[PDB]
Design a protein around this nucleic acid. Structure first.
Ligand code: ZN
Ligand code: ZN
Ligand code: ZN
Ligand code: ZN
Lengths: 67, 68
DNA sequence: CCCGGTACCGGG
DNA sequence: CCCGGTACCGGG
């Protein structure tokens, strides 16, 4: 059907791009950011990803310091 | 604070207007001539699975008795 | 901004 | 009727 754009999918917000024609969806406009489409796109769980990077980062640093 | 859908509409993943329909059963439930019940804790039920499963446990029993 | 958690579309 | 699968609300 009428899928939601990348940003709106990431922010789990109501997207009206499919109605906004070539003009960026309201949301992406209210943020002055390219309203991109990609039926393939999947949301990124930020919070998690960060906790991971911090952990994987410390773990790395720590391991290196072991010399 | 969101408006939950009635049992039947949840079971059928159909648009439910139970709320904006006051005491009168949700549109969908009325047309099906069935009770429009509301239960927050209600979870749908996968029919096709249940059936396929029920047929196996039965057919397994059929082969055992037949294989004798 | 982010997301847990639903409502519901579209199609078989 | 049934559902796979995705849009979006409601809130911190
Ligand atoms: Zn959008
Ligand atoms: Zn957009
Ligand atoms: Zn209903
Ligand atoms: Zn109903």
């Amino acid at each position: 059907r009428k899928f939601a754009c990348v940003e709106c999918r990431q922010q789990k917000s109501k997207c009206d791009a499919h109605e906004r024609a070539p003009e960026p969806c309201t949301k992406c406009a209210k943020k002055n950011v390219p309203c991109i489409l990609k039926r393939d796109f999947r949301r990124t769980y930020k919070r998690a990803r960060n906790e991971a990077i911090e952990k994987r980062f410390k773990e790395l640093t720590r391991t290196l310091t072991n010399l």
